[PDB]
Amino acid sequence: DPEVTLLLQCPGGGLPQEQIQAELSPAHDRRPLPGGDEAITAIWETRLKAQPWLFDAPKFRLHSATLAPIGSRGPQLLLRLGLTSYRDFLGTNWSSSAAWLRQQGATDWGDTQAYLADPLGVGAALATADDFLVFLRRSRQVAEAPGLVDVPGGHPEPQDLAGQLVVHELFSSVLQEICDEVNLPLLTLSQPLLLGIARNETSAGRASAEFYVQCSLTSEQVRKHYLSGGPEAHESTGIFFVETQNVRRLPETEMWAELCPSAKGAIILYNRVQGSPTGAALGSPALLPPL
Numbered sequence: 001d002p003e004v005t006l007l008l009q010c011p012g013g014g015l016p017q018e019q020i021q022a023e024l025s026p027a028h029d030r031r032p033l034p035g036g037d038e039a040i041t042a043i044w045e046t047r048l049k050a051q052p053w054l055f056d057a058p059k060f061r062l063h064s065a066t067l068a069p070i071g072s073r074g075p076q077l078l079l080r081l082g083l084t085s086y087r088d089f090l091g092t093n094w095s096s097s098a099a100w101l102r103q104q105g106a107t108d109w110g111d112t113q114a115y116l117a118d119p120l121g122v123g124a125a126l127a128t129a130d131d132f133l134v135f136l137r138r139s140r141q142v143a144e145a146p147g148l149v150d151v152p153g154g155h156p157e158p159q160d161l162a163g164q165l166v167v168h169e170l171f172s173s174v175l176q177e178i179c180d181e182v183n184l185p186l187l188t189l190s191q192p193l194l195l196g197i198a199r200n201e202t203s204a205g206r207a208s209a210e211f212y213v214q215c216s217l218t219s220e221q222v223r224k225h226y227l228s229g230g231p232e233a234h235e236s237t238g239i240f241f242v243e244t245q246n247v248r249r250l251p252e253t254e255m256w257a258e259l260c261p262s263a264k265g266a267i268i269l270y271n272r273v274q275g276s277p278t279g280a281a282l283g284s285p286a287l288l289p290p291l
């Protein structure tokens, strides 16, 4: 799958909030463009003169992540984070010259991302009480991946000693996105586990943190909540469910061609980190069928 690469796969079935450290530093920001940040300002001004109701918003930037030696005690992951914006995204990753900026970054900084906003996304593998994952159909009128299948998530907005607060807002924001889009009560959801980080090679390498969340409702009760909001309660245009049994081979189905890259990352990491049984009991051939 050329349109998604794994930057990180978490150990132990995924990491809770308490085993993650963040470092939020202006050293983790995008570098100023070789010819000045004027190019981003020009693209923004042009866009507002066609859509004057658009507004900017701050975003987190992923610079890098380091995993501890496996089986160790203490914090297991460090996230190195800066700040970016929707405006900087439109002028870099979403720019037609995005591939030229990646080449210039390799040359100048030995880093394909050095000149890119790279806003951090979040997505969820959301499992029901009756063992399904939750999918959403994207509107055909949106800018990115129109009409494709997605999972719940989005792009959290800011606001280890400021670090711990940053880690809490990331985990809080995946739950809030599930409540806003799927119309579920907060109290039907587990604390999320981080499965890993996935890069969207169709959006110049920007990264999404991918999480596992369990709901205490069945698929049928999840569907009821989603629909009972009506058309204005959600950006998506439909909800559907796949048994966890059948998620194992999803990359061999006709659905795979309709999944947006960030939802591909969520399913690949769910299959590696929550599936793939390591032990003699869940490993047995009747429970884990060959081929």
Ligand SMILES: Cc1ccc(CNc2cccc(C(=O)O)c2)s1
Residues within 6 Å of the ligand: 059, 085, 086, 089, 090, 094, 119, 143, 144, 155
């Ligand atoms: C900071 C974000 C990363 C990706 C986002 C999704 N929305 C989007 C994508 C591509 C163009 C546009 C537009 O408004 O042109 C919107 S939001």
